[PDB]
Amino acid sequence: XXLXXX
Amino acid sequence: XXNXX
Amino acid sequence: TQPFHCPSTQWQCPGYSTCINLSALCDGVFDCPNGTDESPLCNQDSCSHFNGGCTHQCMQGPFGATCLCPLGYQLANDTKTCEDINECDIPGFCSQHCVNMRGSFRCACDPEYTLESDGRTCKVTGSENPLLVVASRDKIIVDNITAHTHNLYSLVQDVSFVVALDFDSVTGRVFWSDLLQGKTWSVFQNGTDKRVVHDSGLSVTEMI
Amino acid sequence: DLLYWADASLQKIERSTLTGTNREVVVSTAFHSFGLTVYGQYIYWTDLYTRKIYRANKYDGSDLVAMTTRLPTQPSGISTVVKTQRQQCSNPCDQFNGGCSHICAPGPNGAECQCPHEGNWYLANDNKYCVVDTGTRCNQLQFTCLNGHCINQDWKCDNDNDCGDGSDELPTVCAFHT
Amino acid sequence: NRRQVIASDLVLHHPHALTLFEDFVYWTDRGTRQVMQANKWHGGNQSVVMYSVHQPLGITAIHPSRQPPSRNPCASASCSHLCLLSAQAPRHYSCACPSGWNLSDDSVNCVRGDQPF
């Protein structure tokens, strides 16, 4: 999972 | 899932 | 019957069947090939020269004196001294407030908590119900923690993307932010009377 | 003298004594663990899920690091190559094939023997000879030569042939005979 | 006094948020999409509290013990608009005012800023 919450 | 190699 | 060892006044070197008497113990050089004929502490003191040098309690076994420390103390690097352990240095040994004492410890906690029968654990003084709330994408899931059992239900009905959560104890309202709607909402813990807090100016509320 | 096993479904590695008494979890959450090996202070296992080789301290699993990057094609199986000879001991099977016909393995007490893969075999003569199970047996007073010819145990290893193939006078039984 | 609760462990994949309780710590993973529980002092006695279809981002434990009471120095403040608590010893509160407002020399009253932007 990527960091950016979007 | 499977347990084979 | 007919034992397979040497009873009476004999002691055996481990790793062998060699039996030696009460005077042959630590008689000199490490005669037993395994080295167990002698020990590093063997007859260091007689346990008679002023308590044998041990600060608390000496006792002599097959290989000389051994120093005993009362429950709570620890043998120092020098084997003849017993010292107090700092039980408060171990993290979590005392839950909230720990006071180091001579061979002992003291514990206390904040007025919101009460110490248990064991003098370490503190438990919440009020009963209530420890309530855990988690923000899933399209649902705010709330867990009713009790008796090692979790009950799951949805707090509110019309959320789209909730990323942050908090609650106010004074009013008993849960505050959350919606990423897709760009708003911050506040609702009671029973899901009623939802209000908007911020309806504009929010872009990505990481935490609240 | 400890036994280590890795479970790929419960996703943890455990250890216990050789008798299986003291079960402990050396490292929980070890992912999809394939074969595992122990060397030195650490245990090394291959993971089918993240395609990496991990290691951890053999007593508490503290120093857990990944030995390799994400391998391209899902590694499986692992072992250690050691140059020093390991725990050498004298097997009983070298001396006259352990007193058995063809195949023996060193058991807890003396040589232990077994029959080949192919054939309706069955064990005889204190389970030290392999013969074909023709649905026939002999009583407690006949020694059984190979292929089933069985004669009274007094002629057994009397330094004279008594069977059709000399099975009785083979050195396997006469190496230690009374 | 920096300590490690859970470290060098594979229980964590991409953890996002955490909250505390009495001797327990709860946190959410965006990688495994599950909410976890562990001992807050050494990370033992772990268990999965919840599985979620979507990524769980936020988490809070609701209880009065999490929200200890205290005296409110801001309650006696005469500040217009915002009265913010502060760590300065004499007063422990400081008046502030929103975006586009001016802090007057009274340090308690603010006036709207009519300057251009």
Ligand SMILES: *[C@@H]1O[C@H](CO)[C@@H](O[C@@H]2O[C@H](CO)[C@@H](O[C@@H]3O[C@H](CO)[C@@H](O)[C@H](O)[C@@H]3O)[C@H](O)[C@H]2NC(C)=O)[C@H](O)[C@H]1NC(C)=O
């Ligand atoms: C969900 O929980 C909230 C918790 O606050 C409930 O709000 C509370 O509701 C009660 C009963 O309606 C309120 O008590 C009433 O107060 C008025 C004066 O404001 C009084 O005239 C009535 O006799 C009664 O005592 C209480 O004030 C209110 N709490 C707050 C902080 O506003 C709400 O009712 C719950 N909803 C459901 C559906 O159970």
Ligand SMILES: *[C@@H]1O[C@H](CO)[C@@H](O[C@@H]2O[C@H](CO)[C@@H](O)[C@H](O)[C@H]2NC(C)=O)[C@H](O)[C@H]1NC(C)=O
């Ligand atoms: C969590 O569960 C407990 C126990 O089921 C709930 O406590 C009950 O609440 C009702 C009112 O809704 C009371 O009439 C009962 O007397 C309570 N029973 C107990 C055992 O206390 C509690 O309401 C739940 N908490 C939340 C916020 O859902």
Ligand SMILES: *[C@@H]1O[C@H](CO)[C@@H](O[C@@H]2O[C@H](CO)[C@@H](O)[C@H](O)[C@H]2NC(C)=O)[C@H](O)[C@H]1NC(C)=O
């Ligand atoms: C999980 O909880 C158990 C207790 O239910 C812990 O086990 C005890 O832990 C204390 C403190 O370290 C030890 O003094 C006891 O000897 C333990 N007893 C047992 C039965 O093991 C355990 O430590 C916790 N999990 C981990 C890995 O810490």
Ligand SMILES: *[C@@H]1O[C@H](CO)[C@@H](O)[C@H](O)[C@H]1NC(C)=O
């Ligand atoms: C004890 O003394 C030895 C030698 O000075 C030292 O190396 C060791 O770290 C000490 N251990 C403790 C825990 O006191």
Ligand SMILES: *[C@H]1O[C@H](CO)[C@H](O)[C@H](O)[C@H]1NC(C)=O
């Ligand atoms: C030899 O004969 C003696 C007779 O008492 C025992 O049966 C012994 O077991 C025999 N051993 C072998 C190897 O033939």
Ligand SMILES: [Ca+2]
């Ligand atoms: Ca000696």
Ligand SMILES: [Ca+2]
């Ligand atoms: Ca102490």
Ligand SMILES: [Ca+2]
């Ligand atoms: Ca013969």
Ligand SMILES: [Ca+2]
């Ligand atoms: Ca990560």
